[PDB]
């Protein structure tokens, strides 16, 4: 089409030292941009499959990406199923289109980093609603009893999501929830995914009272959306889901069934946490988003995350495919 243009860049951010995901260590993480303009029209894309999570690898990422944009040239946008390359085409044209609003809050959980003191000063005089994240099942199950009590008890009106990706057999589950005290156990949002089956991980929050979240589970091929006993939320990750019409279906059968919806990060670079960031506002206005990962990265590209004191690249630095 004489009006369509596309351009699809390739990079590589480095990481801070010490990031692990699934017995992996993350030393850059890799991934593509897709920008398509349409006369005066311009958008954006983020493709950035995620090691040990996404079943495509950066490579045939880029293959299907390649793919797709010489087809959108010829005006055909049909999105192929691959996951991270279906979410960041859907960006673009969503941009293309201002179906996805310009508008985002920029607030998310914040992670804690080992250091719970920090986070607590973080959060004790924050004014409003007070929501944290923490890792769990990386350290002993003690140890992360231990500093989720310590957390509740340092600020009383704290709500903690915990993260455990499965780490857990219900014995590890169980010595986990003996060192919260049961005072507090309410005040957990939700723990996502705390046991290595699903059905252990109902049975902890039945037993226990600790609310649970599913979030690898929605990426599984049995997945049905499901008010349970003991299930408060759903984790969405775009980049591990697919197009931003996908998602939108899977908030929306939440919500449907009463259950939080969470738009979360797989670790993308800030071009695409911003636009986590305006699907967030739109798609789950109420609820604050999972998106507290950038400071895990050395740099920003192209879209730079409010008030990150990063440096950012611009496009002309990045490597050009297209
Ligand atoms: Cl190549
Ligand atoms: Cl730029
Ligand atoms: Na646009
Ligand atoms: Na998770």
């Known amino acids: 089409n004489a009006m369509r243009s596309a351009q699809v860049y390739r990079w590589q951010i480095p990481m ?7 017995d992996r260590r993350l030393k850059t993480r890799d991934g593509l ?28 990422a880029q293959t299907a990406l390649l793919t797709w944009v010489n087809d959108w040239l010829q005006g ?3 999105l192929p199923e691959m996951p991270s390359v279906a979410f960041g085409a859907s960006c673009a044209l969503a941009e293309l289109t201002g179906v996805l609003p310009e508008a985002a809050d920029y607030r998310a959980a914040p992670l804690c980093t080992g250091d719970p003191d920090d986070l607590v000063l973080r959060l004790a005089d924050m004014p409003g609603e007070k929501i944290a994240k923490v890792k769990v099942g990386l350290y002993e199950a003690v140890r992360d009893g231990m500093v989720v009590n310590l957390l509740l008890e340092a600020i009383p009106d704290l709500h903690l999501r915990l993260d455990a990706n499965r780490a857990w057999t219900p014995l590890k589950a169980q010595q986990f929830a003996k060192y919260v005290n049961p005072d507090y156990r309410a005040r957990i949002a939700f723990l996502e995914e705390p046991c290595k089956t699903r059905d252990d991980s109902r049975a902890f929050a039945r037993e226990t009272g600790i609310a649970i979240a599913w979030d690898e589970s929605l990426r599984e091929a049995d997945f049905t ?34 259950l939080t919806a969470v738009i979360s990060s797989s670790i993308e670079s800030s071009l695409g946490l911003t636009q986590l960031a305006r699907i967030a506002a739109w798609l789950t206005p109420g609820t604050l988003p999972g998106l507290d990962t950038l400071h895990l990265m050395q740099a920003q590209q192209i879209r730079p995350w409010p008030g990150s004191a990063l440096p950012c690249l611009k496009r002309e630095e990045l490597e050009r495919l297209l």
């Not at 801070?16 to 699934?22: E, I």
């Not at 969405?236 to 069934?257: C, F, M, N, Y």
């Open 16 to 22: 801070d030292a010490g990031v692990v995901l699934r």
């Open 33 to 60: 941009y897709v920008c398509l303009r349409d006369g005066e029209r311009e958008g954006w894309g983020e493709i950035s499959p995620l090691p040990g999570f996404s079943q495509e690898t950066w490579e045939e």
């Open 76 to 78: 055909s946008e049909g």
């Open 225 to 258: 959306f499901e008010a349970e006993e003991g299930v408060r939320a759903v984790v969405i990750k775009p980049t591990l889901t697919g197009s931003l019409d996908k998602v939108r279906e899977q908030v929306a059968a939440a919500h449907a069934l009463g």
